[PDB]
Design a protein around this ligand. Sequence first.
Ligand SMILES: Nc1nc2c(ncn2[C@@H]2O[C@H](COP(=O)(O)OP(=O)(O)NP(=O)(O)O)[C@@H](O)[C@H]2O)c(=O)[nH]1
Ligand SMILES: Nc1nc2c(ncn2[C@@H]2O[C@H](COP(=O)(O)OP(=O)(O)NP(=O)(O)O)[C@@H](O)[C@H]2O)c(=O)[nH]1
Ligand SMILES: Nc1nc2c(ncn2[C@@H]2O[C@H](COP(=O)(O)OP(=O)(O)NP(=O)(O)O)[C@@H](O)[C@H]2O)c(=O)[nH]1
Ligand SMILES: Nc1nc2c(ncn2[C@@H]2O[C@H](COP(=O)(O)OP(=O)(O)NP(=O)(O)O)[C@@H](O)[C@H]2O)c(=O)[nH]1
Ligand SMILES: Nc1nc2c(ncn2[C@@H]2O[C@H](COP(=O)(O)OP(=O)(O)NP(=O)(O)O)[C@@H](O)[C@H]2O)c(=O)[nH]1
Ligand SMILES: Nc1nc2c(ncn2[C@@H]2O[C@H](COP(=O)(O)OP(=O)(O)NP(=O)(O)O)[C@@H](O)[C@H]2O)c(=O)[nH]1
Ligand SMILES: C[NH+](C)CCOc1ccc(C(=O)NC[C@@H]2COc3ccccc3O2)cc1
Ligand SMILES: C[NH+](C)CCOc1ccc(C(=O)NC[C@@H]2COc3ccccc3O2)cc1
Ligand SMILES: C[NH+](C)CCOc1ccc(C(=O)NC[C@@H]2COc3ccccc3O2)cc1
Ligand SMILES: [Mg+2]
Ligand SMILES: [Mg+2]
Ligand SMILES: [Mg+2]
Ligand SMILES: [Mg+2]
Ligand SMILES: [Mg+2]
Ligand SMILES: [Mg+2]
Lengths: 172, 172, 172, 173, 172, 173
Amino acid sequence: AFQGMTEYKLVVVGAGGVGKSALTIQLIQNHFVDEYDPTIEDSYRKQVVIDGETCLLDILDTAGHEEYSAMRDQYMRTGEGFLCVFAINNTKSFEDIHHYREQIKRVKDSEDVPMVLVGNKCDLPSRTVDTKQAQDLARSYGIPFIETSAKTRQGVDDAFYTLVREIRKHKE
Amino acid sequence: AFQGMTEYKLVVVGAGGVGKSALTIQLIQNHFVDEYDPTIEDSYRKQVVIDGETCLLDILDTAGHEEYSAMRDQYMRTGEGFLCVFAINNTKSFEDIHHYREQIKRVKDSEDVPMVLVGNKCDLPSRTVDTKQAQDLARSYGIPFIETSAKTRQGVDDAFYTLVREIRKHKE
Amino acid sequence: AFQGMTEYKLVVVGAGGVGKSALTIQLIQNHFVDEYDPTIEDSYRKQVVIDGETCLLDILDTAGHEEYSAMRDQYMRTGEGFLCVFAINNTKSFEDIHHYREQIKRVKDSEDVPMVLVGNKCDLPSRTVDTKQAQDLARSYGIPFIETSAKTRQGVDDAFYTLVREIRKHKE
Amino acid sequence: AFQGMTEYKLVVVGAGGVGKSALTIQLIQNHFVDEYDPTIEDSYRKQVVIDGETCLLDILDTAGHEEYSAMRDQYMRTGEGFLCVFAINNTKSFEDIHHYREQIKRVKDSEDVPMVLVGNKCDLPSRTVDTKQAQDLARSYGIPFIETSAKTRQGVDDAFYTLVREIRKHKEK
Amino acid sequence: AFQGMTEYKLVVVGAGGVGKSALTIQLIQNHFVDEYDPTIEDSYRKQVVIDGETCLLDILDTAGHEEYSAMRDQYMRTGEGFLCVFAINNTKSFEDIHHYREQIKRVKDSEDVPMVLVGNKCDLPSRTVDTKQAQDLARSYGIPFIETSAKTRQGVDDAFYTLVREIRKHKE
Amino acid sequence: AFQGMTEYKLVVVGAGGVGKSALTIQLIQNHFVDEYDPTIEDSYRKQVVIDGETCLLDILDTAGHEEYSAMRDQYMRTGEGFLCVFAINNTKSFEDIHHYREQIKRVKDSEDVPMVLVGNKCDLPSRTVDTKQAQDLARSYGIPFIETSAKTRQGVDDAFYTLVREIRKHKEK
Ligand SMILES: Nc1nc2c(ncn2[C@@H]2O[C@H](COP(=O)(O)OP(=O)(O)NP(=O)(O)O)[C@@H](O)[C@H]2O)c(=O)[nH]1
Ligand SMILES: Nc1nc2c(ncn2[C@@H]2O[C@H](COP(=O)(O)OP(=O)(O)NP(=O)(O)O)[C@@H](O)[C@H]2O)c(=O)[nH]1
Ligand SMILES: Nc1nc2c(ncn2[C@@H]2O[C@H](COP(=O)(O)OP(=O)(O)NP(=O)(O)O)[C@@H](O)[C@H]2O)c(=O)[nH]1
Ligand SMILES: Nc1nc2c(ncn2[C@@H]2O[C@H](COP(=O)(O)OP(=O)(O)NP(=O)(O)O)[C@@H](O)[C@H]2O)c(=O)[nH]1
Ligand SMILES: Nc1nc2c(ncn2[C@@H]2O[C@H](COP(=O)(O)OP(=O)(O)NP(=O)(O)O)[C@@H](O)[C@H]2O)c(=O)[nH]1
Ligand SMILES: Nc1nc2c(ncn2[C@@H]2O[C@H](COP(=O)(O)OP(=O)(O)NP(=O)(O)O)[C@@H](O)[C@H]2O)c(=O)[nH]1
Ligand SMILES: C[NH+](C)CCOc1ccc(C(=O)NC[C@@H]2COc3ccccc3O2)cc1
Ligand SMILES: C[NH+](C)CCOc1ccc(C(=O)NC[C@@H]2COc3ccccc3O2)cc1
Ligand SMILES: C[NH+](C)CCOc1ccc(C(=O)NC[C@@H]2COc3ccccc3O2)cc1
Ligand SMILES: [Mg+2]
Ligand SMILES: [Mg+2]
Ligand SMILES: [Mg+2]
Ligand SMILES: [Mg+2]
Ligand SMILES: [Mg+2]
Ligand SMILES: [Mg+2]
């Protein structure tokens, strides 16, 4: 017997200042946060319909640099899917992606963890990471790549919905 | 790709005057039709969420007594699930159920066709078919039984939703 | 920030066989359960809009009788509000309401716990508890009374929504 | 250009205690009001979909007996459609219906006002107005009749939606 | 009696690679398809509210270059409205528009077929078709012009909804 | 007690041609209006969910230059919140903001009126008002600033929803 909607536990990771919170707040509140208030840990929920199925997204917005690795391991174990976010004007955030990805694979003991690579701030003019390089990296991981802007809303729904679709594929 | 919601083709059958149209119109328009205007053939649509899945119900409301058996065979072949309706104050409509069920099995060439047995007009005081007898009949067919009233709306959503759940079970 | 809908933890209590599960399943699935499958402990969720506010109902469906429990107290203490259910054809279930109310006050350590008194099975002809008696009891507790039928769906939404309104009043 | 949903101004009238408020509160809040708190004047709104069209119902719930005639005239002039409610266990409320209908026609200076006749409290056992008599009355007016219960919710949505359908028909005359 | 939502049969036409599929998938799935998988024929559905009316969009996504004339004629006869798509960085796709428009008018035997002219890929910097020229072309046909991006979602809803509004105008 | 969704009366003001109508039509119809059809007065409605609460937005779209100051005063008195719109490629529309804000404060006799400063046409390349200047102005008023495009839809929902959030904050003071 159906006891209520399917729930998906999504975790947003990536370097400090890439726009993890801004992405999440744009999804939840349709609001662009212009201030940079560094996150410790925040949890959000939203019910959405994706491919005809109603679901409850439970979204954990994480800190760029996480002071306890015990707390990091805990959300990595609990998370069913991960948005790995870099900023397209910050080369270092892009180079950091491989470390977030390795950390997640180690904790989950798997090569095939649902993830989406997200290149955020695509509205800004000062691009330093080429779309082709990000696509190549994503292809090497076997995951989707989506360019986003928390400010214009480009790709924001798509990033979260795509991650849910990755989780569903992995669940069969 | 997901190309849009799942569609379910439902057919409502049963003897003249049992309330096939009234059930359908109550589901679609939240309206009780007090007049008895015999049906030839009418089709209705409604999008609903059942157990977290969005679907489009395509509902064929049939005539009690069908003049062309060619037209009957066509909707029976197209239908994915059947509400077999009798009126709880009309013993003959209940005895007719066996015949509707055999006709559907013959046309679809199957023993295992999604169906729900519906005892309608349960608001009326002159009951001639006992709940126990209908439950026994349904149990003998391996299908659900639901008591309904198109007038009070008791069981109306339940009858259609239960049929969708039967179709989904059969599809795996 | 708003971080997603408000959640309300509702607990359904009352004597064995009064229709606690049937009420809950009618709310969640729009389905009347005719069988009596005794509950140990089950949990349901549903997102609804009540007085213009979207919320997530977390509903705990309990057993009629765990004769001693440390375990019972623990799950009951999660509740923010309680539906106290009796059946209108079972005087003993009505007399038991006093004991469910005392148990709730003890576990929550409070005299003022959000609750609604629910008289279920109002469709049956074998009424033994009068509406006036139940209303008097509810008035003596300072809580709402609602007559329900899990079978006809009378009062089902109203019972749960009323409880949410009681919780909101208590929260201010 | 579409500027937002169509609005329909509905007025609920009828004798004191027939269930006008209980009907309206059942529609708006899915709540049965057991208490009898006589109304002075209350307004409610609800967005609904009727025959595939989204609309905003603005519902005026009136007093059974309206002491000052200026107030009554004002809402009758503003209302686009009227639910005329009686209780099926109260013959006097049923006999009053003709007078509510005449009062509406007088104030609006029209013979053709969208209305629905509503027989409420159909859950109660001591029925004194037969369904056939109400149907005959409604037929004599050329309007729909619906039996309702604010308690069980039978017919509640149907009554309000039917009234919207009557208003739409009148707007394409 | 209203028998369920109004259905609109929409057909998306235009040169190879202009983004017919990408537009449709963005509308249906909120997903940007970065890959170029040439279409043979795909059908999609979505229920939406446009100017307060609920409707069911049935969307036929066509091939740039259609190998069978019999298949082309069939969907052109069935389609109620047409999105004629070009890409704003592809002058040839813009010059092709009048051929798609003539083909539709010939098959439907009408001068007054509901259509919208869509300039897609408006996010790209390498624009070769001026907005003014497209507007002039649309004005010459008496139809709306909309600039879209399947990637950013600019204008995507607007293009489909505008076409529905054109169909509704033609239906009176 | 609950009588239907909460209503918010929003007024969109600012100089001629800044995109007041285009913003509103984008919100209501998901349609970009390319033509410049000067407004006299138009009213729009939309039901939305903001922070889990259902609300009915009643939006008054005003004329850039208002011929009767009696009519201006009336909508300013009725409005609960104001979107003050300039175009980011029109310096003069930005300098005019101060005047719309003063006019609103005068008519409402209050220093603390819910408002959002909206820099529209942010899709255009020919920017003449720097985001820093707009942010400073908004900070000086203690109100939010949002960059919008009626064409791309950037910030459109956010502008209206932010204004509702400002109204709600003011209603709990
Ligand atoms: N222009 C633009 N700015 C953005 C975008 N996303 C984020 N920003 C800006 O970048 C800054 C950082 O955003 P924030 O969401 O706080 O980043 P974060 O990744 O959560 N930081 P942390 O890990 O410290 O919690 C903010 O000032 C924000 O407005 C975007 O897509 N475009
Ligand atoms: N009291 C009551 N009357 C009902 C109920 N369902 C239908 N009716 C009434 O029964 C009569 C016939 O119903 P109808 O829907 O037209 O039956 P049908 O099975 O579609 N007839 P046909 O086969 O001729 O198309 C009508 O007078 C209708 O109002 C119900 O549940 N309760
Ligand atoms: N006629 C009628 N039967 C009801 C109603 N509610 C429940 N029932 C019937 O009563 C029986 C017991 O219902 P159930 O919901 O299992 O009761 P419960 O309170 O959950 N029992 P437990 O405490 O053991 O879990 C079932 O056969 C059910 O169909 C009602 O409103 N009307
Ligand atoms: N059993 C039952 N009781 C009802 C129904 N409708 C209303 N009542 C009861 O009838 C009494 C009066 O209802 P109320 O809605 O206040 O009537 P009203 O027509 O609004 N009165 P007034 O004209 O003074 O404002 C209340 O006790 C209410 O619970 C119904 O459908 N069923
Ligand atoms: N940047 C950008 N790329 C787009 C846009 N729309 C489509 N594309 C890209 O253009 C290519 C072709 O898109 P697709 O939808 O297959 O085009 P099509 O018109 O359906 N091709 P065909 O007629 O072969 O079926 C794809 O690479 C797609 O990513 C857009 O608006 N912006
Ligand atoms: N590129 C672009 N153009 C816009 C935007 N908003 C409005 N416009 C254009 O600017 C012109 C003016 O828009 P309009 O909405 O009529 O402005 P308005 O403030 O209502 N003028 P008025 O006060 O005369 O009623 C129109 O041609 C419109 O297409 C935008 O965000 N981007
Ligand atoms: C240690 N013993 C020697 C003495 C214990 O004596 C008693 C005597 C009476 C009681 C009592 O109040 N009975 C109520 C119980 C407990 O909870 C209930 C909850 C719901 C329904 C019935 C219930 O019955 C409980 C214990
Ligand atoms: C000094 N002021 C407080 C005066 C109040 O003035 C007025 C003036 C007019 C009105 C009015 O339109 N009354 C009729 C009512 C209002 O709501 C309605 C809603 C739905 C249907 C009819 C309605 O008619 C209500 C109040
Ligand atoms: C034995 N069967 C496989 C035969 C079915 O053959 C068919 C079925 C359908 C068609 C047909 O109508 N094609 C055009 C399409 C159908 O769907 C559409 C959806 C939306 C818009 C136009 C549409 O036109 C052509 C042949
Ligand atoms: Mg953060
Ligand atoms: Mg029929
Ligand atoms: Mg149980
Ligand atoms: Mg009243
Ligand atoms: Mg294609
Ligand atoms: Mg204007």
